[PDB]
Design an enzyme around this catalytic site. Structure first.
Site, PDB file in Angstrom:
ATOM      1  N   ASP A 111       0.808  -1.209   0.000  1.00  0.00           N
ATOM      2  CA  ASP A 111       0.000   0.000   0.000  1.00  0.00           C
ATOM      3  C   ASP A 111       0.845   1.265   0.000  1.00  0.00           C
ATOM      4  OD1 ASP A 111      -1.897   2.179   0.771  1.00  0.00           O
ATOM      5  OD2 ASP A 111      -3.338   0.519   0.870  1.00  0.00           O
ATOM      6  N   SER A 161      -7.467   4.971  -0.992  1.00  0.00           N
ATOM      7  CA  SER A 161      -7.262   3.531  -0.863  1.00  0.00           C
ATOM      8  C   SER A 161      -8.465   2.682  -1.337  1.00  0.00           C
ATOM      9  CB  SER A 161      -6.826   3.175   0.572  1.00  0.00           C
ATOM     10  OG  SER A 161      -5.575   3.797   0.904  1.00  0.00           O
ATOM     11  N   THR A 204      -8.027  -1.430   1.488  1.00  0.00           N
ATOM     12  CA  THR A 204      -7.451  -2.480   0.659  1.00  0.00           C
ATOM     13  C   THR A 204      -8.043  -3.884   0.835  1.00  0.00           C
ATOM     14  OG1 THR A 204      -5.397  -1.183   0.393  1.00  0.00           O
ATOM     15  CG2 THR A 204      -5.295  -3.525  -0.237  1.00  0.00           C
ATOM     16  N   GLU A 259      -1.555  -7.872   1.799  1.00  0.00           N
ATOM     17  CA  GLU A 259      -1.304  -6.440   1.837  1.00  0.00           C
ATOM     18  C   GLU A 259      -0.366  -5.931   2.918  1.00  0.00           C
ATOM     19  OE1 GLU A 259      -3.628  -3.716   3.702  1.00  0.00           O
ATOM     20  OE2 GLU A 259      -3.215  -2.013   2.398  1.00  0.00           O
ATOM     21  N   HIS A 298       2.205   8.773   5.267  1.00  0.00           N
ATOM     22  CA  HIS A 298       1.338   9.870   5.685  1.00  0.00           C
ATOM     23  C   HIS A 298       1.972  10.408   6.962  1.00  0.00           C
ATOM     24  CE1 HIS A 298      -2.114   9.358   3.016  1.00  0.00           C
ATOM     25  NE2 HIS A 298      -1.985   8.053   3.126  1.00  0.00           N
ATOM     26  N   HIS A 336      -1.370   3.158  -5.306  1.00  0.00           N
ATOM     27  CA  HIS A 336      -1.065   4.524  -5.766  1.00  0.00           C
ATOM     28  C   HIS A 336       0.320   4.934  -5.214  1.00  0.00           C
ATOM     29  CE1 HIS A 336      -1.962   5.207  -1.608  1.00  0.00           C
ATOM     30  NE2 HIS A 336      -3.069   4.509  -1.770  1.00  0.00           N
ATOM     31  N   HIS A 386      -1.365  11.086  -0.873  1.00  0.00           N
ATOM     32  CA  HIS A 386      -0.994  10.098  -1.884  1.00  0.00           C
ATOM     33  C   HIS A 386      -0.702  10.940  -3.121  1.00  0.00           C
ATOM     34  CE1 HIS A 386      -4.179   6.979  -0.285  1.00  0.00           C
ATOM     35  NE2 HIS A 386      -3.224   7.194   0.592  1.00  0.00           N
TER      36      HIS A 386
END
Ligand SMILES: [Mg+2]
Ligand SMILES: [Mg+2]
Ligand SMILES: [Zn+2]
Ligand SMILES: [Zn+2]
Ligand SMILES: [Zn+2]
Ligand SMILES: [Zn+2]
Lengths: 449, 449
Positions: free
Chosen positions: A51, A102, A155, A322, A331, A370, A412
């Protein structure tokens, strides 16, 4: 003896300062690549979603953990590669929204349809669309859902939930933000409630908090979602020992691994990024988070187990794994946490490849949803955002920046990114594709419909 | 025999809001990929470089000129793709240098040896290294060096000059910046001086400024670099008119097209990004530059002329075409100019693939020297740096950010980026590779000994 090769070694061949010493290649690849093209049907498939793990992310972790001349045995060992677009759409206008969140990206690869940021399993008209996992189950194949975040997180939630907002974790949230999905309002249910309904044979992750909620309506009303799961016949394991004591996992006794009240603990402790950090503070050297634990399963462990349990299904299996905090620490402007997560993913990907390579009829894809914030910059950089200096494996100093937000978190980004694969139909990632294409690649590969 | 095809159309199939509407693929790539693989001898090499054209620089340009579902006829048409590392070396220590400068990176593909940020054709010990243009020519091939910047700019200079510093354009600077390279001090000459000693069949681009410089030694002392150029046998051309009249380009009649004393004109114009530029200022639409002229050849035209003249050579040829100002406009934090330059290159890549696809033995390579600052952020982002909102082909607004510097320009970045190829030996750019491999690959493809 046809076998399909994996990059056994693309680390810089020699002395980085010597002519030819940085060459990762030792010869002509035409032949090995030819040995990579196989359109035979894929029995099993493993999708590894890092992710937020864009190309910048990948480079930053390799430089630090493996050194610039290094090579990740997992993430980098995949032969077929390309770049796929992952823009989203504006719910109102139906026009592209260049930077997705997400929920949307997840929707488009698990369903094959573009949606708006915040949507899970529905398009912009809020119409449910069957997810590849749901379709695999329908076709009779085993299914796995593994993550290091709350299972209610975007996700993984996307493989088994259809709600107008990703934010509708459980009853309490759904009621208020997704009254259309509200159980006590005639709706399908909350993310958690829908998870329990999808019944994947194997599901491992965190976010135990929500399972403490009780249903507003339905058959298990008043009982918690956890009490429900048991009544529904799920085997609940809450740690590594119990996780590995699991002998079988199927439609009769489905496994539900809840290893944390929320997201599983990050692998590396490190300070956050600071304004003028690479100059006003000394270089940082990440250290292991003592909370990672011996009782807490690691990414490659859950991954390994899931393959162990899903490989019983003679028809085959679909598994999604994931690495959740790569994005959470991007972040967070905490380079160390961001990187630890990438290393962890790498190990899971190796486990995938060790198996796939052995089985001979699997399709393993490693990619991200992303791009993100982090940027590798010169050491003497004077930037307006958050910056941190770090002591790489190379015994050199890499500086990382985050310059896409003055508020709380770093956003993102919409740049196109890497996607690589190994196995049957892997030829379908090469070149430029779109995140939805993936849904079809996985679909045709399995032979669904 | 099925001679290598080019990705005909990676654009979105139908209605992006619809299931499968945003798809880029129409079938299984396996077979199209199989006819793309050839370990046969490449007869000519056309190498297109976008200075600072990373995947972000690429995504934005696409979103703008073609819209998200869009597709670049040339840039995106390259069937084989990969990612490649381009770190530099810290001169004194030998250790890796994560974020490189245009000089160090160019040498890496031009000579196949990793140097330090600033050097040209020389290693960390300042030792010279034969360049690919020097090897091609010395083997008999016709060579071409084309770019939009002053010909003494790093990317184009690295093919012909060996100096410790890019700054050593001509006589004056070399004398005080690169003494051992100074003609007086027995050196091989300034960048421009060496350019001349080099004698590539075709050299097009700007830079004329430094050619007025007069020599301080050699058999052409007191004479200007331009007076020497003619005297030595070169044929000069300052505009498109005369470039088209040129029916020859060979060793005893080399072509030198100086189209500007400095860097040639950028295609479009626009306002530079500002603080909260997306929130406080209206969106933008790029203005085609009135002053680019019908007399100043476009990048695509120069490429086209170059190929015609370079193809009369029975032995084969090596060409380098550079999209110079993407990096300069990216440094300038001016989206529209960066974007227009990414489109201009697309055209050149088109012309290249054109000749190539028909020729049947031309390896076309399209990449960048290093990543840059630009990043695609949500239209509502409050960022620390420069932000600009744009009006795209989609009839929507895209918001670009530049926040990796508080100083003069936006820095380069050290992320790994795309590398796409087409023709015999293209297989060698797939997967992770290092920029120096490109040298070894180009050398082997051509068959240089
Ligand atoms: Mg996630
Ligand atoms: Mg350049
Ligand atoms: Zn995400
Ligand atoms: Zn995120
Ligand atoms: Zn550059
Ligand atoms: Zn630059």
């Amino acid at each position: 003896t046809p076998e399909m090769p994996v990059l056994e070694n693309r680390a810089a061949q020699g002395d980085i300062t010597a002519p030819g010493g940085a060459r990762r290649l030792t010869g002509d690849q035409t032949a090995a690549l030819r040995d990579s093209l196989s359109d035979k049907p894929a029995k099993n498939i493993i999708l590894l979603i890092g992710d937020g793990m864009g190309d910048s992310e990948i480079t930053a972790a390799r430089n630090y953990a493996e050194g610039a001349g290094g090579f990740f045995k997992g993430i980098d060992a995949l032969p077929l590669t390309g770049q796929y677009t992952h823009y989203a759409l504006n719910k109102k206008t139906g026009k592209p929204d260049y930077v997705t969140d997400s929920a949307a990206s997840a929707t488009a690869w698990s369903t094959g349809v573009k949606t708006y940021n915040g949507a899970l399993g529905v398009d912009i008209h809020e119409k449910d669309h069957p997810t590849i996992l749901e379709m695999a189950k329908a076709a009779g194949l085993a299914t796995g859902n593994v993550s290091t975040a709350e299972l209610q997180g975007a996700t993984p939630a996307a493989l088994v939930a259809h709600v107008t907002s990703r934010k509708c974790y459980g009853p309490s949230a759904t009621s208020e933000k997704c009254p259309g999905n509200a159980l006590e309002k005639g709706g399908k249910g909350s993310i958690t409630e829908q998870l329990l309904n999808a019944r994947a044979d194997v599901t491992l992750g965190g976010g135990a908090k929500t399972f403490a909620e009780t249903a507003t309506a339905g058959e298990w009303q008043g009982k918690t979602l956890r009490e429900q799961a048991e009544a529904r016949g799920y085997q609940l394991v809450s740690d590594a020992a119990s996780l590995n004591s699991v002998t079988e996992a199927n439609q009769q006794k489905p496994l539900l691994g809840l290893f944390a009240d929320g997201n599983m603990p990050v692998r590396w402790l490190g300070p956050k990024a600071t304004y003028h950090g690479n100059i006003d503070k000394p270089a940082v050297t990440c250290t292991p988070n003592p909370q990672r634990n011996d009782s807490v399963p690691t990414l490659a462990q859950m991954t390994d187990k899931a393959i162990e349990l899903l490989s019983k299904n003679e028809k085959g299996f679909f598994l999604q794994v994931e690495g959740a905090s790569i994005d959470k620490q991007d972040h967070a402007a905490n380079p160390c946490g961001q990187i630890g997560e990438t290393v962890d993913l790498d190990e899971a990907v190796q486990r995938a490849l060790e198996f796939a390579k052995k089985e001979g009829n699997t399709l393993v894809i490693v990619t991200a949803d992303h791009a993100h914030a982090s940027q590798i910059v010169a050491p003497d950089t004077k930037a307006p955002g958050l910056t941190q200096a770090l002591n790489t494996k190379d015994g050199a100093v890499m500086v990382m920046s985050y310059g896409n937000s003055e508020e709380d978190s770093q956003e993102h980004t919409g740049s196109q990114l890497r996607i690589a694969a190994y196995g049957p139909h892997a030829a379908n990632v090469v070149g430029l594709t779109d995140q939805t294409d993936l849904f079809y690649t996985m679909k045709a590969a399995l032979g669904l419909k």
